[PDB]
Every structure is written in structure tokens, then in C-alpha cells.
Amino acid sequence: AQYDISFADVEKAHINIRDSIHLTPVLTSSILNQLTGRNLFFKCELFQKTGSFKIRGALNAVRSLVPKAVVTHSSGNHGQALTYAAKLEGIPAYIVVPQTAPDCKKLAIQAYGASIVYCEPSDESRENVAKRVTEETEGIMVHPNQEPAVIAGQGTIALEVLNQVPLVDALVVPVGGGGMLAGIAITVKALKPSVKVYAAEPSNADDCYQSKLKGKLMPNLYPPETIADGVKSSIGLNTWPIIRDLVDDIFTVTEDEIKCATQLVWERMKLLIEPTAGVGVAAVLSQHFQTVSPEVKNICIVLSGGNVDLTSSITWVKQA
Amino acid sequence: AQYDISFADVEKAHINIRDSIHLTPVLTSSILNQLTGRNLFFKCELFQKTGSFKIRGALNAVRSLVPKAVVTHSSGNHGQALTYAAKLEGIPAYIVVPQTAPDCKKLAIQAYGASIVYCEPSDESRENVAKRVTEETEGIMVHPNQEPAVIAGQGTIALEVLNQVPLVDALVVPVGGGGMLAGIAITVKALKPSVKVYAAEPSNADDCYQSKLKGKLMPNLYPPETIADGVKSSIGLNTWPIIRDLVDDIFTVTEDEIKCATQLVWERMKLLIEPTAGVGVAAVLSQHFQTVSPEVKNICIVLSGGNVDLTSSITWVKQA
Ligand SMILES: [Mn+2]
Ligand SMILES: [Mn+2]
């Protein structure tokens, strides 16, 4: 009944950020339609300010939380977005980043003027270090996915999608911490609950899937190994209840599927998505998705970001 | 006064192809605006059917030229577009392609069902082989840039741009054979001749520049070596007069500039342009472009194609 955000929070966030973000386009692909048998729509958040949708939750959080500094932990995208948002107000940013995050993300964070602080690649390390930095700097913590203002910001994506694709039957959303999935679920289920909300998740980081299956929050026991570098976080205490109750299903995809789907988008849509964003595309291409009812025809997939290391990616790109 | 096409040809082409092509979007970048001091608009032909604008001239040509087969020579983009267009009518295609064309383009041509015929990398070889194949197959030749129906098809880009960017002050167009540049020049100068039409050309393939300078057609003496694989052709007899009289200026760009600009678009706009399409971006970023009057503020650059070999490109991508 009551979750940590409401639809009204999202509507408000939208008004309050819309003049500072892009109303990103929805693009289509006949090749992907052919491959899936569905009518796909791609919400291009890769074109958002800073390279990902995270500017939404960051701007909303900065504006709303009334400071000496802002602090967060991030695999890169929330960090750069938060940095940018804070810089606009003249507030310094400290960003805790796992040592194994992509270089491109590490560099962008520094380019926006943040103090970057490397941690170990685990949820525990991210959280503990950010807590310590918060204390040391007397800054304000802006969590990448569990903070209500952030979740409400991410949910604004759905307000746009429902307007841009009026006949939409489902949204497909990549899931890490569940900030975006939760905000979108709140939004869709408030406006038009007949529209499906589906999560897409790496098999190699499948806490959300396992949580849903078990009926309780089950965080990743070991730090995930995945090319989907932006969804290694486990779901949290604020997003789980929303996901439990409002998300229709969760589809897992293997590393191979993620790589194949990412490459397909690059080659056929000419959109430089990051592999994390290739998760949702893989989901719709997957065998299990074939079990979704044929009535679920018009599907919008969120292409969540385009912050990818071009040279790293050559490692996995598949020759014909 | 009279050239091989007229504005009316372009208007007609537009009506006749518009239901079979995409009305591609115009995107913007604040980073590129900052770098240039101008207000840039990017016409995303990389999102066109087949990966480039060439579907325009191909569809127009196929529909218009009333056949046993169609024949052409191409570095890849016109070939795949022509193949697709012909396949829609059930007509076989023979495509003459230089041995050194990108694999991705060679493969796509074959995927669309063409018979591919490799030639040497020269204008002379392309032309001579296509003539022979034309004779042998009793097919119809559809030249990639000198055929009036093709030129008129490419010019339709300008009809869209002038509508999408009503305040436009200049178009910047990459030039190879001059099919697109010529069609666009005819169009712009007929509708609103105050709008500048500028060509962008590799220094390593600078026939168009040299022709303009000398006041006569001066083809490349040696086969160009350039990463801009799609603009190695020299201008021809039908496009030159149009270029001579209607194009405002021609900007040359070095290989380094082309690589830098291409990479910038990839990283900052998330648009998987091919290097040929990076030619026009390089032009606007170039030192010489700084000499263009500050009144020329709103500039639309045509991102002409996105048919690039991902793995080849790793050779030149510059680390930070
Ligand atoms: Mn997960
Ligand atoms: Mn040239």
C-alpha cells in the first residue's frame, strides 16, 4: 500500500527536472522486431546528460536535499551524474568507486571535478567506504538506488514512455539496485497497471530474480562478475518491497546473451549502448521471453546508458 | 542555369520515397556546441534503412528506371542500398566493390543477396568493371553518384533539414562523388539560397577542393588512402558543374582530424558513425572553419552513415 515513494513524488520530480534533462527519443528497429516477433520501442537514455538516465535521480536528489559536499558510491554512472548535478550548485562531490569500474567512468567522474575514492568491488566495501567518507567530509550521502528522491527521479522515465508510446504493453528495465525498476513500477502501476513491468538481470548477478523466487531479499553472496558493470549491486531495502509487489516478472540473461545483444544494437541500430543497457535487449531476445503472451505486443526497452570503454569492448566483440 | 537535376526532381523524389525511408532525427550536443562556438544540429542518416542515406538515391533510381538485373560499383553503402531496393522489386543485383572495402560492407551486400564482384581500388577499375558486368548481365547500371535519379534522391535530405531546423544557416556535407552534395546544393539554393552549403573532404582525397580551386574537374591522380572509406571516389561530370556553381566552400580535414572527430561523436553523442561521416564533424571542428562568419550560427552536419567495422576501428581509437 505505501512504499518509500509514491506516484506523486514522481510527477513532482518530473516537473522539477524536466527543464534540465533531455526528453530522449524512442527509436525502433525492424530487424529487432523480426527477431522477436514483437513491436519494440527503444527509450534512448544513452543520449541523456552524462550518458545515462542517472541524471534524473541525481538532479532530483540535489535539488531536494536542501551542504558541505555530496557523497555516494557508484560503478560510475550515478557518480558522474551526481557530480554534475552538484557542480551546478557549487557543491563538491566525493565519489566512492570500485577499483574495477571502467576507466571511462573513472575518468569522467574526475573530469566533472569530483574527488574519486577507490574501494573494493563489493556492496559491503562500497557502502562502508561511502559511510566513512560521509562522516569524514561531513557531507550528505545520496545513495545510487535506495534514496527516495533518486528513485522518484528515475521513475520519470515511465512518464515519458507512456506518453511517447501510447500503445505500450510492457516496459523492460535492467535491474541493479532497483532504483529505476522501482520508480518505473510505481509509475506504470499508478497510471496504467495493465502495462507490464519486466526486469532484466544478468544470470551472473541474479539477486533480484532469486529474491522474487524466494519471496525475500537475497543479496549476492559473492561480488558478481559480469560485463554488465552497472548492475552489480544487489537490490536494497527500499526497492525490494516495490519490486516484490509491483514488478510482473524478471528475466535473466547470460553473459553471452548480453554480449550478443549489445553488439547487435551497435551494428544494427548504430547506438553505442553500454553492455549494461544490452541486458534488457537480451531479455527480449531470450528464449524465456517467448513465453510472454502474444497480447504483450508493444514493448519498450530502456537503453539505460552509453558509457562504454571502446577499447575494452574489443576483447569481446564477435567476428562474423 | 540548367544542371542534370532540378529542384522539382528532388521534390518528386521525396514524395516517391518518403513512405519507404525513415524521417531521421536531428540531434544536438552541448559539448560539440562548446567546442565550436556554433549551434550544431546533426542529421542522423546513420539511422536510415541500410545504415546510410544511400537508400534515398537507390530507391529513387530503382522506382524510376522502369529489367534483368541492376549493376553498380560501390565502396559498400550504395551497393547495399541498391541491393535492398532492387530486392524489393524482385530484381537481382550485381555489385562491383573494391577489394579493400570494409568487411562489414562486403558482408552486408552479400546478406541482401547480391552477387559481389571485387575490383581494384581505383575509380578506373570500379568504372571499367561495372561497365563489363553491365554488358555481361544485360543489366541496368545505377551509378552511385552521377545518375540523376540518384542525385535527386540524395537531395531530399535537405528538404527534411530545412523543415526540421527552420533556423538553419548552413549545411555541412561530406563529399565523395558529389551526389549528395549536389542534390543538397540544388535543393537549398532553390528554397533558401542564403543558407550556406559547405563540403567537407579528406585532405587525403581532395579532388573536390582542388577542382574548386582550379575552376575545373581534377580527379584524384592516385587512389586515395583514407579511413574515410566512403569518399574515395572523385567527383564526376554531372555533379561538378553543380558543385562549381552552388557550393559555398570546401573544407579539408586530415586523417587525424577525422579519427578524432569520429571518436568524439562515439564517446559524446553515443552515435556509431562511420569514419566517413566523421568528415563533416571534423570540418566544423577545424581551424579553417573558424574563419566562417559568426553570422553562420546554426549549422546542420549530415551524419551520413554508420556502417563501420567495430574491430578494425580499434586499430585507431586513441586512448586517453
Ligand atoms: Mn542483480
Ligand atoms: Mn574527394
UniProtKB/Swiss-Prot annotation, chains A, B:
TM stretches of this protein: none
Amino acids binding Mg(2+) 1: 11
Residues that bind pyridoxal 5'-phosphate: 77, 145, 176-180, 304
Keywords assigned by UniProt, alphabetized: Allosteric enzyme, ATP-binding, Isomerase, Lyase, Magnesium, Metal-binding, Nucleotide-binding, Pyridoxal phosphate, S-nitrosylation
Positions of disulphide bridges: none
Annotated binding of Mg(2+) 4, by residue: 238
GO annotation, biological process: D-serine biosynthetic process; D-serine metabolic process; L-serine metabolic process; pyruvate biosynthetic process; response to lipopolysaccharide; response to xenobiotic stimulus; serine family amino acid metabolic process
Chain sites annotated for binding ATP: 29-31, 49-50, 80, 112, 270, 307
Positions contributing to Ca(2+) 3 binding: 201, 205, 207
Annotated binding of Mg(2+) 2, by residue: 169
Residues with N6-(pyridoxal phosphate)lysine modification: 54
Binding residues for Mg(2+) 3: 201, 205, 207
Catalytic reactions on record: L-serine = D-serine; D-serine = pyruvate + NH4(+); L-serine = pyruvate + NH4(+)
Location of S-nitrosocysteine modifications: 104
Catalytic residues (positions): 54 (proton acceptor), 75 (proton acceptor)
GO molecular function: ATP binding; calcium ion binding; D-serine ammonia-lyase activity; glycine binding; identical protein binding; L-serine ammonia-lyase activity; magnesium ion binding; PDZ domain binding
Post-translation changes: S-nitrosylated, leading to decrease the enzyme activity.
Function of the protein: Catalyzes the synthesis of D-serine from L-serine. D-serine is a key coagonist with glutamate at NMDA receptors. Has dehydratase activity towards both L-serine and D-serine.
Protein name stated in the entry: Serine racemase
Native species: Homo sapiens (Human)
